[PDB]
Design a protein around this motif. Structure first.
Motif, PDB file in Angstrom:
ATOM      1  N   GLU A  51      79.068  -0.277 -46.139  1.00 45.23           N
ATOM      2  CA  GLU A  51      78.922   0.653 -47.383  1.00 45.23           C
ATOM      3  C   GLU A  51      80.133   0.496 -48.320  1.00 45.23           C
ATOM      4  O   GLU A  51      80.164   0.862 -49.469  1.00 45.23           O
ATOM      5  CB  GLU A  51      78.626   2.117 -46.632  1.00 45.23           C
ATOM      6  CG  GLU A  51      78.615   3.085 -48.050  1.00 45.23           C
ATOM      7  CD  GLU A  51      79.173   4.243 -47.406  1.00 45.23           C
ATOM      8  OE1 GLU A  51      79.178   5.193 -46.648  1.00 45.23           O
ATOM      9  OE2 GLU A  51      80.610   4.282 -47.989  1.00 45.23           O
ATOM     10  N   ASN A  52      81.587   0.820 -47.535  1.00 43.89           N
ATOM     11  CA  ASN A  52      82.663   0.945 -48.534  1.00 43.89           C
ATOM     12  C   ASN A  52      82.536  -0.514 -49.353  1.00 43.89           C
ATOM     13  O   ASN A  52      82.960  -0.270 -50.469  1.00 43.89           O
ATOM     14  CB  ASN A  52      83.776   0.821 -47.605  1.00 43.89           C
ATOM     15  CG  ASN A  52      83.936   2.275 -47.134  1.00 43.89           C
ATOM     16  OD1 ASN A  52      83.418   3.006 -46.380  1.00 43.89           O
ATOM     17  ND2 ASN A  52      85.435   2.644 -47.357  1.00 43.89           N
ATOM     18  N   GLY A  53      82.066  -1.593 -48.906  1.00 42.47           N
ATOM     19  CA  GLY A  53      82.172  -2.768 -49.777  1.00 42.47           C
ATOM     20  C   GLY A  53      81.243  -2.706 -50.631  1.00 42.47           C
ATOM     21  O   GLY A  53      81.316  -3.127 -52.035  1.00 42.47           O
ATOM     22  N   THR A  54      79.779  -2.350 -50.075  1.00 45.70           N
ATOM     23  CA  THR A  54      78.748  -2.541 -51.214  1.00 45.70           C
ATOM     24  C   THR A  54      79.107  -1.202 -52.195  1.00 45.70           C
ATOM     25  O   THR A  54      78.767  -1.518 -53.340  1.00 45.70           O
ATOM     26  CB  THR A  54      77.474  -2.132 -50.529  1.00 45.70           C
ATOM     27  OG1 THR A  54      77.305  -1.165 -49.926  1.00 45.70           O
ATOM     28  CG2 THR A  54      77.130  -3.507 -49.898  1.00 45.70           C
ATOM     29  N   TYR A  55      79.431  -0.163 -52.077  1.00 47.38           N
ATOM     30  CA  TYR A  55      79.659   0.672 -52.949  1.00 47.38           C
ATOM     31  C   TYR A  55      80.717   0.204 -53.982  1.00 47.38           C
ATOM     32  O   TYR A  55      80.588   0.565 -55.046  1.00 47.38           O
ATOM     33  CB  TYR A  55      80.105   2.114 -52.403  1.00 47.38           C
ATOM     34  CG  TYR A  55      80.313   3.224 -53.558  1.00 47.38           C
ATOM     35  CD1 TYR A  55      79.317   3.631 -54.205  1.00 47.38           C
ATOM     36  CD2 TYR A  55      81.630   3.449 -53.715  1.00 47.38           C
ATOM     37  CE1 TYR A  55      79.510   4.766 -55.073  1.00 47.38           C
ATOM     38  CE2 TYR A  55      81.949   4.652 -54.675  1.00 47.38           C
ATOM     39  CZ  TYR A  55      80.739   4.913 -55.489  1.00 47.38           C
ATOM     40  OH  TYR A  55      80.986   6.060 -56.450  1.00 47.38           O
ATOM     41  N   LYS A  56      81.919  -0.152 -53.570  1.00 45.45           N
ATOM     42  CA  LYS A  56      82.868  -0.647 -54.326  1.00 45.45           C
ATOM     43  C   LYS A  56      82.327  -1.930 -55.294  1.00 45.45           C
ATOM     44  O   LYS A  56      82.770  -1.779 -56.597  1.00 45.45           O
ATOM     45  CB  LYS A  56      84.028  -1.280 -53.600  1.00 45.45           C
ATOM     46  CG  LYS A  56      85.167  -1.570 -54.436  1.00 45.45           C
ATOM     47  CD  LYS A  56      86.650  -1.930 -53.733  1.00 45.45           C
ATOM     48  CE  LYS A  56      87.764  -2.499 -54.366  1.00 45.45           C
ATOM     49  NZ  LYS A  56      88.893  -2.768 -53.649  1.00 45.45           N
ATOM     50  N   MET A  57      81.513  -2.684 -54.618  1.00 39.86           N
ATOM     51  CA  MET A  57      80.781  -3.824 -55.486  1.00 39.86           C
ATOM     52  C   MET A  57      79.945  -3.013 -56.806  1.00 39.86           C
ATOM     53  O   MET A  57      80.292  -3.427 -57.937  1.00 39.86           O
ATOM     54  CB  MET A  57      79.507  -4.410 -54.618  1.00 39.86           C
ATOM     55  CG  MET A  57      80.247  -5.467 -53.809  1.00 39.86           C
ATOM     56  SD  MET A  57      79.011  -6.184 -52.745  1.00 39.86           S
ATOM     57  CE  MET A  57      79.632  -7.345 -51.684  1.00 39.86           C
ATOM     58  N   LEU A  58      79.414  -2.008 -56.461  1.00 38.78           N
ATOM     59  CA  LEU A  58      78.589  -1.425 -57.449  1.00 38.78           C
ATOM     60  C   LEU A  58      79.269  -0.563 -58.552  1.00 38.78           C
ATOM     61  O   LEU A  58      79.319  -1.013 -59.582  1.00 38.78           O
ATOM     62  CB  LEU A  58      77.382  -0.493 -56.763  1.00 38.78           C
ATOM     63  CG  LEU A  58      76.471   0.156 -57.789  1.00 38.78           C
ATOM     64  CD1 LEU A  58      75.728  -0.870 -58.677  1.00 38.78           C
ATOM     65  CD2 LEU A  58      75.434   1.071 -57.034  1.00 38.78           C
ATOM     66  N   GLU A  59      80.015   0.202 -58.127  1.00 40.01           N
ATOM     67  CA  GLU A  59      80.701   1.233 -58.908  1.00 40.01           C
ATOM     68  C   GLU A  59      82.008   0.579 -59.380  1.00 40.01           C
ATOM     69  O   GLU A  59      82.267   1.048 -60.666  1.00 40.01           O
ATOM     70  CB  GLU A  59      81.161   2.405 -57.885  1.00 40.01           C
ATOM     71  CG  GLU A  59      82.059   3.407 -58.796  1.00 40.01           C
ATOM     72  CD  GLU A  59      81.542   4.209 -59.663  1.00 40.01           C
ATOM     73  OE1 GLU A  59      82.310   4.862 -60.508  1.00 40.01           O
ATOM     74  OE2 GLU A  59      80.231   4.261 -60.053  1.00 40.01           O
TER      75      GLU A  59
ATOM     76  N   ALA B 256      87.553 -11.660 -54.124  1.00 43.15           N
ATOM     77  CA  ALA B 256      89.180 -11.286 -54.311  1.00 43.15           C
ATOM     78  C   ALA B 256      89.507  -9.792 -54.660  1.00 43.15           C
ATOM     79  O   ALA B 256      90.502  -9.183 -54.377  1.00 43.15           O
ATOM     80  CB  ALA B 256      89.730 -12.165 -55.395  1.00 43.15           C
ATOM     81  N   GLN B 257      88.564  -9.340 -55.339  1.00 41.95           N
ATOM     82  CA  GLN B 257      88.612  -7.957 -55.872  1.00 41.95           C
ATOM     83  C   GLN B 257      88.220  -6.879 -54.885  1.00 41.95           C
ATOM     84  O   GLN B 257      88.610  -5.432 -55.016  1.00 41.95           O
ATOM     85  CB  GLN B 257      88.150  -7.611 -57.101  1.00 41.95           C
ATOM     86  CG  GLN B 257      88.817  -8.505 -58.395  1.00 41.95           C
ATOM     87  CD  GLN B 257      88.059  -8.607 -59.624  1.00 41.95           C
ATOM     88  OE1 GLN B 257      87.120  -7.826 -59.986  1.00 41.95           O
ATOM     89  NE2 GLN B 257      88.140  -9.953 -60.319  1.00 41.95           N
ATOM     90  N   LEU B 258      87.465  -7.277 -53.815  1.00 39.23           N
ATOM     91  CA  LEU B 258      86.950  -6.263 -53.024  1.00 39.23           C
ATOM     92  C   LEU B 258      87.704  -5.557 -51.740  1.00 39.23           C
ATOM     93  O   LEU B 258      87.453  -4.396 -51.696  1.00 39.23           O
ATOM     94  CB  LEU B 258      85.668  -6.674 -52.245  1.00 39.23           C
ATOM     95  CG  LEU B 258      84.628  -5.744 -51.818  1.00 39.23           C
ATOM     96  CD1 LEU B 258      83.996  -4.947 -53.172  1.00 39.23           C
ATOM     97  CD2 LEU B 258      83.358  -6.490 -51.171  1.00 39.23           C
ATOM     98  N   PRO B 259      88.565  -6.289 -51.315  1.00 40.94           N
ATOM     99  CA  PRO B 259      89.276  -5.715 -49.976  1.00 40.94           C
ATOM    100  C   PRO B 259      90.210  -4.552 -50.568  1.00 40.94           C
ATOM    101  O   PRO B 259      90.664  -4.436 -51.650  1.00 40.94           O
ATOM    102  CB  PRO B 259      90.372  -6.828 -49.667  1.00 40.94           C
ATOM    103  CG  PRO B 259      89.566  -7.889 -50.045  1.00 40.94           C
ATOM    104  CD  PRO B 259      89.034  -7.691 -51.376  1.00 40.94           C
ATOM    105  N   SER B 260      90.660  -3.500 -49.400  1.00 39.79           N
ATOM    106  CA  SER B 260      91.340  -2.680 -49.864  1.00 39.79           C
ATOM    107  C   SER B 260      92.682  -2.856 -50.353  1.00 39.79           C
ATOM    108  O   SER B 260      93.615  -2.238 -51.103  1.00 39.79           O
ATOM    109  CB  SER B 260      91.773  -1.847 -48.479  1.00 39.79           C
ATOM    110  OG  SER B 260      92.089  -2.699 -47.485  1.00 39.79           O
TER     111      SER B 260
END
Lengths: 320, 321, 319
Positions: free
Chosen positions: C187-195, C254-258
């Motif tokens: 979820e931390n990745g799918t939320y960051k994708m969407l938001e 590239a933009q997704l990781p912490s």
């Protein structure tokens, strides 16, 4: 919670699926059941998993994984354990605390029947548990099947009808043997905590561990060595404890691993050999996991001591 | 004698009951055969791929999909784990894609229990000393289109069953269930190489297990063939528990088994297949083997370990640094 | 597919097996059910697994693996997730998108009841899903059990009778808290994708991930930190996507990781302390998996960005 009633759920699966599991169920003339998991049959991964779960009184989950990575490092099929009843499952049931000696049958008995015969008494005092049940299930590390006199002796000691005794058997030198012994990874830590470190194991709220399945060696002395080494050199454990004022959890963690023992540093077979095949010459503190991780819920501290020793595991198993 | 069709049917029934949960589609043909689309017009799912693979093994293996726990920088992927205590029957009597199915313009290799009724090919069944007896036949097919009535009728006739009791599971190479089911062949690749290339009696394999990564899905069927092979040939680990007899040379079986023992090992399979002008005849068939092989000889206690998992070639095959 | 009806399957197992799972089921006088998974009870590995499955609306598989290979490398018990309904399970259900504030009960509410109350509305528009059901199941990360007023507020927001509300509760500082937060790795990745990335998460066809169970710290701030750190330094994710013309999946990866966020590099507790314990000074893009792997099924490309940081995990956990 009754370890015998809970383990019977898994014994019933083993019996119904005997053919699928390559094990053999027999009924003795007195009505006791013997479930051969490796004497005259091959057994199986699933039989080993289920046998271990019955050793744990049904109060743990048991799986067979292949942990390890996309790399050159040595990896093996391994047994993982998770328990939320750590003293009861590992010491009230799993520990091989009953010396079973009847005629020429000699074996250590593990599993929930120990919580009806109270074998040994001091374990049940210290973990404050006893079972009450009308059936008794014991597992036996042995190279032959037990007969009617062994079943009757277990029945009388557990206070149950012999027709309600269930005995699971597998030699050290079998797949089920390697699996069940690897599955004692967590037990080796809780028993060392209790017997050697004098730490109150009722404080261990959750526990998990993993250890490799040792290669199967037909020589029972060699199988003892390689299966112990699986735990001693290959085992990882995770204990979640609730310490109290005056406890020194950092010391418990540092004292627990196999490497803290005297005589450590060689494959067990070689240690036992150096000792003249005599246990008086062996530090029993060596029987412990390779690596120990302890989270103290009272303080939030995490401790990690020991480590898995792949060089010594490979030496034990005979590979470079 | 265990029946791979009857045992696999227990898993087919879960796939049918749970088809919507699994993102697969069950259809009934006009002749009464059942087709279970696990990737042609539907997405499939991790669990569909697990269950597909269990069906290919005749129900005589456990299949899991693990997500690896590795707290390090090393490359790791979701993987398929296999455990079997019926190794030759499950992997060769059922799983191996030994039936060439060619009916009109439908062409695929067929795998699974139905092979043990049509005896495809005969020699496998003679050598593993197994044949099934059943009144239903279950086949899985790696194909890019759904088979129709004539393909089902052909399979029924070859299996000596009524076509109304045929069940066909289908997924393209280029699908999630394709990458799962081919990674799930990690153990098979070693047992078939033992049997056909090394002339080792695989009835001596008492237990077996293995693991291989799930390859990324490439929509190009030729690229997908390369990446999914590479998952086994470079990423697969296998564990064989054998009972040797006097005169066996288990050390040599172990050394001879891995993919790296083959001539032409050492490049992604797409490149091996291309350097070979896209023709299977110019390819050492010993290349189709697990990356790493561990053998425990129960007769002696010996452990052997040969080959290795080659992360650099998995990354090269998959296009990552 | 109904996330409430599907999660109810798991709730029923938690209810039946409550004693075996070290959890406590109570009924409030209004008929709502409270399932305490860590306030006054110990919970268990399997309770945390089932709690996390209920958070995902029953539309994911959850496991607890005991990793630990044959090397000196650090390894911990870990939570693995697999889902074939990735936006619906992780955003339509799992995301803790409902601020529950009733009297002096404050908690973020996660799970399928969010798809009846539509909390928040934009998520349900963007994933094109809403539930229809006559029961509501919510999970709550809280240090105390909710009472009748909280249950009645949920019931009214979700359009159900309060007698058909089920509340699962565990503190951050509990085994179930550590498990359910590690279970948010995907979820931390799918939320960051969407938001953050404005990527259409309906294009995620499959997803999986794994993160370690953080050590339990009885201080709620330190627990917040260590459980976050499990995902942001220890989490791996795998997204199978179907890109369309115009998409840049290499940039998404590239933009997704912490590690792409500002303030990355310190245990979260320390980041937060530096920020004066104020979420305003924090880059919320730091709430992401450590490592991200994306397979684009439209092209066959594989991308790998970020990496698990074992040294910072160890720092965070004090070893």
């Amino acid at each position: 919670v009754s370890v015998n009633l809970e383990a019977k759920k898994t014994v019933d699966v083993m019996i119904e699926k005997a053919d699928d599991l390559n094990i053999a169920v027999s009924k003795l003339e007195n009505g006791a059941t013997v479930i051969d998991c490796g004497v005259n049959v091959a057994g199986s991964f699933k039989a080993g998993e289920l046998y271990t779960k019955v050793c744990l009184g049904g109060l743990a989950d048991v799986g067979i994984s292949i942990p390890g990575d996309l790399s050159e490092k040595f990896a093996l099929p391994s047994v993982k354990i998770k328990t939320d009843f750590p003293a009861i499952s590992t010491l009230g049931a799993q520990k091989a605390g009953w010396s079973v000696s009847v005629g020429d049958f000699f074996a250590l008995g593990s599993g929930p029947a120990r919580a009806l015969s109270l074998k040994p008494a001091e374990t049940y005092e210290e973990i404050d548990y006893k079972d009450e049940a009308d059936l008794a299930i014991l597992t036996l590390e042995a190279d032959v099947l037990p007969g009617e006199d062994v079943a009757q002796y277990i029945a009388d000691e557990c206070g149950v009808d012999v027709a309600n005794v269930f005995l699971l058997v597998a030699p050290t030198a079998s797949l089920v043997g390697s699996i069940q012994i690897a599955g004692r990874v967590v037990e080796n830590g809780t028993y060392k905590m209790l017997e050697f470190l004098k730490f109150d194991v009722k404080k261990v709220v959750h526990a998990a561990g993993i250890a490799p399945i040792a290669p199967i060696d037909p020589d029972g002395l060699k199988a003892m060595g390689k299966t112990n080494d699986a735990v001693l050199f290959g085992g990882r454990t995770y204990y979640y404890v609730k310490s109290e004022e005056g406890d020194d959890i950092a010391a418990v963690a540092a004292q627990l691993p196999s490497s803290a023992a005297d005589g450590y540093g060689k494959p067990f077979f070689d240690v036992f050999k150096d000792a003249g095949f005599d246990f008086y010459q062996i530090d029993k503190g060596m029987f412990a996991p390779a690596e120990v991780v302890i989270n103290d819920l009272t303080t939030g501290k995490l401790y990690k001591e020991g480590f898995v020793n792949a060089e010594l595991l490979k030496k034990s198993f005979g590979i470079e």
